[PDB]
């Protein structure tokens, strides 16, 4: 799966973090992003933890900080950033 975003929900976590449509996640917390499932599980499990993202906007790197919104979940407090993945 291509680690590109399609849209960012307004007034969400990825909105205040600076993420935009077309941005490509490259690194998360230092280590590169080879599996999109790792970033998905990091956004899911961590509910209010600062995640350092190295993205490539327009082909150029940029450093942002993402703080997932603690969306209510039955099992446990879940993390929602408001990112729409790339349409397959």
């Amino acid at each position, epitope marked *: 799966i291509e680690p590109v975003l399609e849209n960012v929900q*307004p*007034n969400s976590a990825a909105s205040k973090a600076g993420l*935009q449509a077309g941005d490509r996640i490259v690194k998360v917390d230092g280590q590169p992003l080879t599996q999109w499932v790792t970033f998905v599980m990091l956004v899911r499990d961590n509910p209010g933890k600062s995640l*350092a993202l*190295e993205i490539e906007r327009q082909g*150029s790197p940029l*450093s*942002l*900080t993402l703080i997932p919104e603690s969306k209510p979940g039955n099992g446990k407090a879940i993390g929602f950033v408001g990112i729409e993945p790339k349409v397959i």
Partner: antibody
Amino acid sequence: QVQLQQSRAELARPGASVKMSCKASGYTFTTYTMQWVKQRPGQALEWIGYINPGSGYAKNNQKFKDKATLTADKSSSTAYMQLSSLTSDDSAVYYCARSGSFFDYWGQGTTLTVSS
Amino acid sequence: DIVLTQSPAILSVTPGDSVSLSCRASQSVSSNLHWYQQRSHESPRLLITYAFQSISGIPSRFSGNGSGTDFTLNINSVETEDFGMYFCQQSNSWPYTFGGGTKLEIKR
């Protein structure tokens, strides 16, 4: 809680070089992108460029291709901007800003006067 | 090179009316446009992020709308601490560019 301490005012001889600082206080300095913007007295803002502390990647505007040189130091938590080959058109107020998309936290302003 | 055009450059308003500042672009920046307020002899202040999304710090009277290649910043009841320069900055492509600037003066 989050402050950007910029260098004090500067006077420079024409043709020399200057190197101003922007010490960040109150956040993880390596995860947020630093931005440098120019403003001449009475005119609009002018985006000089940005830099990623920790990785050292600096991307400047095409006008500030070689005029501006962006560096970063993680330990001192300080981003430096160097201006080489100074002319009269370099007299302006220079700001540093936080974040890589929108500029949330701004600095005080380093005023550079280039005269002999 | 996305050239943000901020028109007009100066607008005089009686301290109490509404203000709609324009900021037309040249290419599709979608909703990647933010507004900044600069008071005289000060540093810029972040007002609205991404066209309409409000920031945690600005009063309720500051809002805005627009998309693509047309944006508008709305100030409802203008107080005395609202005059000065206003700039629009796009973050869609490279390089980042600011607006021409709109000056808010008091009417007399």
